[PDB]
Amino acid sequence: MDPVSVWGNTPLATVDPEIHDLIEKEKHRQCRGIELIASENFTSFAVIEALGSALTNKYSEGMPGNRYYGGNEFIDQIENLCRSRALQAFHLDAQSWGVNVQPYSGSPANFAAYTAVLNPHDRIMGLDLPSGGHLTHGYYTSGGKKISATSIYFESLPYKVNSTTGYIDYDRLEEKALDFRPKLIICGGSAYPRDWDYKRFREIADKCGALLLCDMAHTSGLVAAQEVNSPFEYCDIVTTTTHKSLRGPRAGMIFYRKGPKPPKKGQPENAVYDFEDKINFAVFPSLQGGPHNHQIGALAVALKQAASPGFKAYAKQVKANAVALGNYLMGKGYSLVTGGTENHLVLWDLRPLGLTGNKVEKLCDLCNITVNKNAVFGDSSALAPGGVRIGAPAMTSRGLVEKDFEQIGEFLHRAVTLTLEIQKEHGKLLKDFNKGLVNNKAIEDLKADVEKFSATFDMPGFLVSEMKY
Amino acid sequence: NMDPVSVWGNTPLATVDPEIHDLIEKEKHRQCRGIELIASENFTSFAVIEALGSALTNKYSEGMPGNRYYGGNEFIDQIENLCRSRALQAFHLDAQSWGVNVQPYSGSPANFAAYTAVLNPHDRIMGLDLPSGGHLTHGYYTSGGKKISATSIYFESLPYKVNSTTGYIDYDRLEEKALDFRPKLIICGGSAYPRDWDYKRFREIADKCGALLLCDMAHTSGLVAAQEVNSPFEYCDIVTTTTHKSLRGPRAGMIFYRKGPKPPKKGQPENAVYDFEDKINFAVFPSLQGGPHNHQIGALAVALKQAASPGFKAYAKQVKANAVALGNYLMGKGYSLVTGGTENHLVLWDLRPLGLTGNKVEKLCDLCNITVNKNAVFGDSSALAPGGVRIGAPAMTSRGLVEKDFEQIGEFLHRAVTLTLEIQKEHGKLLKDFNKGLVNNKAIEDLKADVEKFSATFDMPGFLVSEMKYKD
Amino acid sequence: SNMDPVSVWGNTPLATVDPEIHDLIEKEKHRQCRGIELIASENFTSFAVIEALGSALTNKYSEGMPGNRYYGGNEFIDQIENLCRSRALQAFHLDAQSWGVNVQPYSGSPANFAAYTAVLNPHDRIMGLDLPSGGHLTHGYYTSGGKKISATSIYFESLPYKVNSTTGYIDYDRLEEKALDFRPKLIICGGSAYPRDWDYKRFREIADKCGALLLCDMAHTSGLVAAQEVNSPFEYCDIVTTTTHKSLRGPRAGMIFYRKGPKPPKKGQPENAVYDFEDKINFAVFPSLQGGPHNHQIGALAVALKQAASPGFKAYAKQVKANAVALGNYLMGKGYSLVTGGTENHLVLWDLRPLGLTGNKVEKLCDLCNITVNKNAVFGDSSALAPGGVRIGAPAMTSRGLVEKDFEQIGEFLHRAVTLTLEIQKEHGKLLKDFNKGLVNNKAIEDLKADVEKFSATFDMPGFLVSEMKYKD
Amino acid sequence: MDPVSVWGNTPLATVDPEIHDLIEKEKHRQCRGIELIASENFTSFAVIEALGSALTNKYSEGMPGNRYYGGNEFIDQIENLCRSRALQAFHLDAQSWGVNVQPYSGSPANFAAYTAVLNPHDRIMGLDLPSGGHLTHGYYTSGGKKISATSIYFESLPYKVNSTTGYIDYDRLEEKALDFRPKLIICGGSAYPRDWDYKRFREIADKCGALLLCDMAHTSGLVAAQEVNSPFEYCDIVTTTTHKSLRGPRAGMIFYRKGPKPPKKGQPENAVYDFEDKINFAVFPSLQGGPHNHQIGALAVALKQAASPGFKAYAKQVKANAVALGNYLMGKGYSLVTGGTENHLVLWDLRPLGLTGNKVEKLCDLCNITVNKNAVFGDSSALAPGGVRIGAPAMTSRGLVEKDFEQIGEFLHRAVTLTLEIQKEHGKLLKDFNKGLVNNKAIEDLKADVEKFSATFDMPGFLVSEMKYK
Ligand SMILES: Nc1nc2c(c(=O)[nH]1)N(C=O)[C@@H](CNc1ccc(C(=O)N[C@@H](CCC(=O)O)C(=O)O)cc1)CN2
Ligand SMILES: Nc1nc2c(c(=O)[nH]1)N(C=O)[C@@H](CNc1ccc(C(=O)N[C@@H](CCC(=O)O)C(=O)O)cc1)CN2
Ligand SMILES: Cc1ncc(COP(=O)(O)O)c(CNCC(=O)O)c1O
Ligand SMILES: Cc1ncc(COP(=O)(O)O)c(CNCC(=O)O)c1O
Ligand SMILES: Cc1ncc(COP(=O)(O)O)c(CNCC(=O)O)c1O
Ligand SMILES: Cc1ncc(COP(=O)(O)O)c(CNCC(=O)O)c1O
DSSP states (O other): OOOHIIIIISOHHHHOHHHHHHHHHHHHHHHHSEEOOTTOOOOOHHHHHHHSSGGGGOOOOEETTEESSSOOHHHHHHHHHHHHHHHHHTTOOTTTEEEEOOOSSHHHHHHHHHHHHOOTTOEEEOBOGGGTOOGGGTOBOTTOOBOSGGGTSSEEOOBOBOTTTOSBOHHHHHHHHHHHOOSEEEEOOSSOOSOOOHHHHHHHHHHHTOEEEEEOTTTHHHHHTTOSOOGGGTOSEEEEESSSTTOOOSOEEEEEEOSBOOOOTTSOTTOBOOOHHHHHHIIIIIIOOSOOHHHHHHHHHHHHHHTSHHHHHHHHHHHHHHHHHHHHHHHTTOEEGGGSOSSSEEEEEOTTTTOOHHHHHHHHHHTTEEOEEEOOTTOOOSSSOSEEEEESHHHHHTTOOHHHHHHHHHHHHHHHHHHHHHHHHHOSSHHHHHHTTTTOHHHHHHHHHHHHHHTTSOOSSSOGGGSOO | OOOOHHHHHSSOHHHHOHHHHHHHHHHHHHHHSSEEOOTTOOOOOHHHHHHHSSGGGGOOOOEETTEESSSOOHHHHHHHHHHHHHHHHHTTOOTTTEEEEOOOSSHHHHHHHHHHHHOOTTOEEEOBOGGGTOOGGGTOBOTTSOBOSGGGTSSEEOOBOBOTTTOSBOHHHHHHHHHHHOOSEEEEOOSSOOSOOOHHHHHHHHHHTTOEEEEEOTTTHHHHHTTOSOOGGGTOSEEEEESSSTTOOOSOEEEEEEOSBOOOOTTSOTTOBOOOHHHHHHIIIIIIOOSOOHHHHHHHHHHHHHHTSHHHHHHHHHHHHHHHHHHHHHHHTTOEEGGGSOSSSEEEEEOGGGTOOHHHHHHHHHHTTEEOEEEOOTTOOOSSSOSEEEEESHHHHHTTOOHHHHHHHHHHHHHHHHHHHHHHHHHOSSHHHHGGGSSSOHHHHHHHHHHHHHHHTSOOTTSOGGGOSOOO | OOOOOHHHHHSSOHHHHOHHHHHHHHHHHHHHHSSEEOOTTOOOOOHHHHHHHSSGGGGOOOOEETTEESSSOOHHHHHHHHHHHHHHHHHTTOOTTTEEEEOOOSSHHHHHHHHHHHHOOTTOEEEOBOGGGTOOGGGTOBOTTOOBOSGGGTSSEEOOBOBOTTTOSBOHHHHHHHHHHHOOSEEEEOOSSOOSOOOHHHHHHHHHHHTOEEEEEOTTTHHHHHTTOSOOGGGTOSEEEEESSSTTOOOSOEEEEEEOSBOOOOTTSOTTOBOOOHHHHHHIIIIIIOOSOOHHHHHHHHHHHHHHTSHHHHHHHHHHHHHHHHHHHHHHHTTOEEGGGSOSSSEEEEEOGGGTOOHHHHHHHHHHTTEEOEEEOOTTOOOSSSOSEEEEESHHHHHTTOOHHHHHHHHHHHHHHHHHHHHHHHHHOSSHHHHGGGGSSOHHHHHHHHHHHHHHTTSOOTTSOTTTOSOOO | OOOHIIIIISOHHHHOHHHHHHHHHHHHHHHHSEEOOTTOOOOOHHHHHHHSSGGGGOOOOEETTEESSSOOHHHHHHHHHHHHHHHHHTTOOTTTEEEEOOOSSHHHHHHHHHHHHOOTTOEEEOBOGGGTOOGGGTOBOTTOOBOSGGGTSSEEOOBOBOTTTOSBOHHHHHHHHHHHOOSEEEEOOSSOOSOOOHHHHHHHHHHHTOEEEEEOTTTHHHHHTTOSOOGGGTOSEEEEESSSTTOOOSOEEEEEEOSBOOOOTTSOTTOBOOOHHHHHHIIIIIIOOSOOHHHHHHHHHHHHHHTSHHHHHHHHHHHHHHHHHHHHHHHTTOEEGGGSOSSSEEEEEOGGGTOOHHHHHHHHHHTTEEOEEEOOTTOOOSSSOSEEEEESHHHHHTTOOHHHHHHHHHHHHHHHHHHHHHHHHHOSSHHHHGGGGSSOHHHHHHHHHHHHHHTTSOOOSSOOGGGTTO
16 A cells, blocks of 8 residues: 555645646636626635545534534534534524534525425425526526426426516515415525515515525625624525635535514414424435535634624625725616615626627636626526626625725726627627637737736735745 | 735634634544544545645536636636546546536435436435445435435335345345336445445346436445446446545545447337436536535545555555454454445444444444444334444555454454443443443543554544644 | 015116105205206206216226227227217317317316326426416315315416406416416416406417417306307317316216317427327326226217207307396396406306305305305405305206396396395394394295295206106195 | 207107117117126116216205205205215214215225325325236336326335235235335225235234225125125225126215224324315315216115115125136136135136137127226236136126026137137237138127027116006
């Protein structure tokens, strides 16, 4: 065999220079560009140290103090600490709320949450994907093609935003819920630029007999910082990712109510919530196997970080940065969904200009401007949807303030002005528009300007001064 | 006022979070000061860990390489491409005949994705019964009818069993059951089965009943990569696996699927090609998962390189030799091993002839720094107090232990079980009474000290012991 | 310990084998011709139909299709079933290369469940008219409280469409909107208490927009359809189901019509594409859902389908519609509220809530007066026990020969019944147990029963000779 | 409009001469041949008079006293009498049993019974169709094709008879039930020639947690006459048709337990059965609409007839006739599944002779001998199965006794010998064999002998001229 030191203790740069080289290049990409994917962030080195740790070695199926394996003395303390810090980060009373921190990621957390409270084929309603909801909110297409497993194993009827204002159509939602009678109503979304009227969602849920779940994955950092409405006030269950605005590792959690139910006509006195055992069982043994304890430890670190005054100031800045970027784009005459934002992102409708989102995402990516084409209301094609989604969390984490985001706006303005000029000269068909991308001097200049701008800012997670490139 | 970036973002865990830092340091200590015998556990390499804890965690990359839903994946695509190519290479697969998806978060998501790819809800599956050695996700429901795995809720499961006396898979009963039940999918591979699999026979059975054949090689994938056990790829349509067990990688999953022309079947169009790739990819994303965890994928690409090396082959040989040597020691003491030995990395130990349940042995061992898990054995209904303990060699073999060290582990386990027997005789079989013997017990203290001394004489992969906070 | 002679058990009349059942049937015969039968789904079928219904045809097992049976001995059963199917196509003026029919469903609800089983997998999506809006149980009925009632809401995923709250007409825009979000595999039209005709053309437009199959359940108006007195669903629907005992005036049975031959031009469908319903629908009926056909029903149905094709039957269906209108006009001449303010078919749906009444009260008092109706849900109802309406149909009494002025008398009898219901309620309270107290020893109920009976006995009765009947007064 | 008397009172022979002629030809066919379909019977004129009556005109959804329509004063009394005569015919205590008599037929009864106690995709086990079970007992084929909706809306795992004895393999049933964990186990069958160990079925159901349902459709008449084991002693639910050995109209019935549950380790004290409301709801409003009241009335007549001493003697004779036919066939060296019968039918395995049942059924049909081809153990083809099923109820109703059924045995022996000869001349292929079914002198002679034989017997189901006084 090989001595332990050789295969087991040698650094990555020697054991696997090919992968090491690719990681170093990805590290250089991350701080040499403008990273505007609304679901991305740059997590802390401390989170990354817990992530890449011996915690990966441990099997710990079960719950702390009730495991299927020996050896979990410290894994249990880690998971317990993570759970308690999660309640604290979101200002929850442990007698009123519990949390499962084992979901591998956001989509597993939602599927487990649904499995906990729903039987196969029970009805759900979530925000329609083109209106800003997530895949796992029951997404099938307007052509009736079932995409998400949440529209396969359950019966989805999505609700939509107002086609002209972009705000959730609460009236239609209530009418729909009353006809369809969902077992579960989901709120929260992936590309909705406004806050959520959780009070109205509760009102509606109560009127049709549904459970109410909020998926706060995108805004969970703003929620912890109390910079947006808290779903916990009104929802039975709250799921979330931990890697977005929360700035943690890639993981999920499922919060659930505990204790006495609020008085409701038709329900016994002393009625208590009964989510905890079902939610735990749905994560394990129903759906997952071994928890990823390096994720839980990393999560515990990020949850402590999210409770700090500094994180709260970061969340304020994210919102202020998104507003300042949005105001810049509208000041150039561009069209934002709902005409502004209340959170970390803006949804920018490109159809009034003539372009689809893949065109500007492709050109932007050539300029080290990382966005993602994103569905907008009415869209039927995931290849060429009508908009781009831009978020502030990632570059806010690198220290940027409003003026820097106005310069980001300026770069996007240039990128889109180039996009239209390439379209007005080489056509609207895709491959014909690709022609204007090869050896484009204005792209190279925009790229050079973007790299120059990006390199002026700090980078969490790792030392620029030690990276290979 | 926002924190300066370095203050929250560039400072070490030791400073940002002393509590978690200390707990990770205690766990690192616990990992090298005991004997780790959980068959599904391993100690992965520092190189794997360096990729796992990396900026790769920052990137959203839904889709496939070259077909993503986000910009910025120039290097993610190369890493995932590399990871998939090394996966095929590790298992000696022709890329015209096999593809792989390396995005599943873990083994259970890999299986549920593979099922979702090829099955509609409520379709029929057949896997090894859990008390016979099969995994949760192979359709586990209890002998009392209680649906446990979601793979028994969203699909219709009919488990097959081992022979009640011999402990080997009853292939005749499996075929008879399969022909009556008519499953869409037959699953092989196990979690607590100590023998190799007659995959050729599984193929014949699957052909007779029209079923797909999937092997879950999570436990033995390391031995398969080293060609130390039967390869499921010769006969199975689909192979799922985890990567953190005998394969010694990160925690992740992998789905392998055939590609290219299908073999001849009467009633098949000629020039018929497999059609798994698109379905399997689609099942993983956008059907079930969201963003890949690229730090896992990167770490996996590193582990797959390490598993394709001569030293890993010799590791896999040693793992098997250690399990055998340990099984022989235990059996020499009169202990019952299911199937009377092993052909892989684990032994399944039936404690019932001793008048013991595995939770008692597990608890006592844990106090002695011997880390095992209680395990169901044939006929068990209690997951709380099943009739067995399961012992594996991958983890301690990765620390450099050879047969004589595993005979020593056999003796420690012998002492552990003898002690458990003594506690029970003094205080009683009830768990509340038995626990009364676990407190201030000098022989537990003594066995623990002996285990810690033995365990401390071996190297540890993954981190430098000279660097750890708790060296004593 | 000996076997009875065959004739003793097997050839003796009901009147001697079973005096108690014979007497009860004689009392039901008396009941049927001595009151006013206004249940919209009831009719009085012919003696000829009844003679086929009670026949040796009941003795035969004939699973399968004519010429492809699982039993021998079907030489004549095959000819009867073929004649029934061909007469079914002819009664609805269907080209046999464009339409086929299955005449084995035991009744209307089996017919629908089979039609759905043929074209749907379990949990597939369906949209039918909401029951309080006029749709049938088997059209996906679950309550506004979310309780699944019909198995069609258990084995399939239902989303009902509704009428406009104020007008009572189907809200076609809301249906289209709902269909586009819900994406049903099947849209159902036809109803049980919808008093207007159906815009089948619009249903086809909606169904094509969402890629759904389109099925019409014409159970209630099938007689009016055969007579070409209402819109024909066959122009626009893929599948048409129906009972045969309602306005069609036959036995209790069901039928499933389905298209055959080339499919009309649709972008995305291959050229030379043909319908593929026949095998699927037959298989759903048998072996999937039913066992042996009820050949006495099929024979009787064959008789009814011949009778439905006659000039006299078309005149019947015109008189049914004229009678319903005359009755509706009389009722709203008194200020009563009919849903949609009138009718285009055989029934009216009478919303009693503006009177402060529920249908179960009116139904109970009517029954005591020999006026046979049924309480019936109206828009917004949640209670099947005490719904807000009563439904009145013309088919049964029209079959006894009643014309418009007779139906205006019926309206007056109904007006008197509702007035008495109001007085009993005013005097005895609105709670059911208190209202019931006013139904005992009530002279006006006695008087109205007497007037109804004397009116009722002035008309003929199909199905049996009143001159042979045991209870002639 | 036609006067009422023209369209509505004129007899069938004038309104519709075509259908009248076909019915008359069918009556002639029924009394001129030998009717051996085990599921067929000749019902009484009294039953038929109730079936063809003004009861067909009434809508009566709901239960007696709780209808969705007015006017049910007398339909309620008819249905109540039907239900109580159903309990009486099967010697059931009304405190311990209820019955729903609205199922349109046997298959509707079973699907409703299952819908009452099962959720979609719940697990059931019934006797495999080639082993003798019914379509509605979860039938999918050995090639895995779902055939019955009971294998589509529910999850079926059939249990089989012993391959070599033809008797149900109870040990394998138990083993299967323990592995599969069905919610419902069904017993009773369509082509099983032996009685059922209901005691063992109860033991197996108690052991795996399942409800136990008997579909007694084929033997219900023998059950009412207490000539076979009663399923009611051990089963939670008993479904049945009424038109087979029970000699009634085509209808279904669902019996269900009521009252205190028998002592069971785990069940709370004072536990009561809770089937009634669920069974009623499953029939209506879940699955059916309006009851067919003319069937309910005709059923009430048949149930009174089934309670009689003469019907008990009929049931004895059915069983004696099946035994005598079975012994005659075996005496010719033919193979019967299980080597005999304990009920009304014999299942005849034609494979040892190189024959499939469709050939025998076709030939027999040409000779006015009405049988049905029938699957036997191992069969995959429904078109050309391995056997023929022969039943005694119908001929017995015409007064035939053991010697008459031995002559039937001889006609069957002649028919099969004649089939084994048309297959030497013409070949095993259907289209080939089929050529010998035209201008066959032996077929013609056999048909004439069968005719002469059948014409010597009485026939129920028309009115006797002397009784034209009442
Ligand atoms: N053969 C085999 N052994 C194995 C596993 C496996 O999948 N297969 N496991 C990992 O792969 C662990 C055991 N996984 C299990 C998880 C839940 C239950 C179970 O029956 N849970 C019920 C009862 C709980 C109780 O009794 O306290 C429940 O959760 O309610 C059994 C085994 C370790 N050993
Ligand atoms: N054991 C048993 N015998 C019985 C019946 C039964 O239900 N069970 N039957 C009454 O209860 C009749 C047979 N009923 C059957 C109906 C359909 C199929 C069947 O498998 N049909 C397929 C194959 C068609 C073909 O091969 O041509 C199909 O319809 O697609 C089999 C038997 C008479 N004998
Ligand atoms: C055969 C098999 N398949 C899949 C899994 C699941 O892997 P994850 O825990 O990553 O989901 C396991 C885990 N079994 C763990 C054990 O046997 O102890 C397994 O044994
Ligand atoms: C609202 C929401 N919920 C759950 C998830 C799932 O997280 P995972 O990818 O870890 O499964 C996402 C991810 N959406 C990513 C994006 O909006 O770009 C999300 O936006
Ligand atoms: C056991 C059994 N159960 C139910 C039925 C169905 O009855 P209906 O055909 O009325 O739906 C049958 C009919 N089997 C007919 C035969 O054996 O020939 C049956 O044999
Ligand atoms: C539209 C419609 N479809 C099907 C049926 C069912 O017929 P059966 O009862 O034979 O199952 C009805 C009966 N409804 C009766 C009524 O409206 O009063 C109906 O109105």
